């Protein structure tokens, strides 16, 4: 029931700064270390630094001491990662992780990890998505199985989340990695395979959430006879 | 700084088979005082944060199944999975916590090997809503195939298209071990309305010959 809850996705402009937060619960915040780790797309983990929330004292990797500053607020059980003077190399996911403080030592593995915070560094503005239905062609329903979906188009930055029928429909769902279009905006599809006989009868709604733009959209997908 | 090195960078193994993967450090992680190796392994599944798997080189974390075993000492360590299951696909990375700055290996990507599965192909004409906005996106879905390598080509009135499509592929499914793929053809409304036949042609190991899924605009 130990958990570290991280702040949401950040879009920040080159040269400016960002603060990532890590709120601990289910344990005594001041009795374990908080570690911070960087992960760039599909690449290895890099250790940034560590803070003792009881004393407030941080220790940095020499690779990050100018880029990163660690603080902790005891009253709110929250640790913070401040990143400064940002560049495109700072676009990454930042994890906080807990590490034991047993036997008076900081030399420990990392036993509980937050979900990560995505930071995108860019001069482009936030933009919410348009959501379009993906209705199968007739022959894309042959043989008793069909597919349908939603196209989540022209948004910035990543990520979006997509569910179906408010989470009741999970079987056969595929939500694809977004691609960056030549406009500099992302486009993503989510699809689900369903019995072809159900296209007339069951309601299918994709639930789209783009938290950077505070955009929430539910789109009902219907078949098109054409 | 200590350098952590992992091999192989990736491997594929069938369900039920044994896998071993290697982690080395540029200097010894064995502390003479307490005879412990300051070495951990993490598992990172797609869409997820790293999860602690092994520490002190050979201690399983609470709740980790016993088919995961860590071994080794000093500078040479191994992670063994005795009988791989379909849900074990992940990147496995090691970490030394012996010396600041703490450092991680680059990870071993474990992929699941299964029998060949041809894709099921579906195609979606653009919606009337989108067409009102001046653009037409045509989407082709390749569902539940294996192996990952697949080729998609778009044809508009049998003219091969270049430069106007993008695609992306899911991570491997943790249950049936397949992949899926989505490709989007983007045209202006004006161009969409000037042509009749929209086709995605799919090449894959499980298909004896390429498969074309197509529709005619306005018959669809
Ligand atoms: Cl968020
Ligand atoms: Cl907007
Ligand atoms: Cl209709
Ligand atoms: Cl298990």
Residue numbers in the entry:
A (entry chain H): 1 to 226
B (entry chain L): 1 to 220
Please give me the paper's original passages concerning this structure:
Here, using structural analyses, we provide evidence to explain why a vaccine targeting the membrane-proximal external region (MPER) of HIV-1 elicits antibodies with human bnAb-like paratopes paradoxically unable to bind HIV-1. Two rmAbs, 235 and 460, were further selected for structural studies using X-ray crystallography. The former recognizes a MPER-C helix epitope while the latter recognizes an epitope in the MPER-N helix. Here, we demonstrate through structural analyses that the approach angles of the vaccine-elicited MPER Abs are poorly suited to access the MPER crawlspace on the virion surface.
There is one Fab235 per asymmetric unit of the Apo (i.e., Fab only) crystal but four Fab235/MPER complexes in each asymmetric unit of the Holo Fab235 crystal [designated LHP (light chain, heavy chain and peptide), ABC, DEF and GIJ]. CDRs of Fab235 reveal two protruding loops, the heavy chain (VH) FG-loop (CDR3H) and the long BC loop (CDR1L) of the kappa light chain (VL). The VH domains of Apo and Holo overlap with an RMSD value of 0.29 Å (Cα atoms only) or 0.48 Å (all atoms), suggesting a typical “lock and key” binding mode. Nonetheless, the V- and C-modules move relative to each other due to a range of adopted elbow angles unrelated to ligation per se. However such flexibility is insufficient to overcome a mismatch between the Fab235 vectorial binding and the MPER-approach angle required to enter the gp160 crawlspace, impacting Fab235 function.
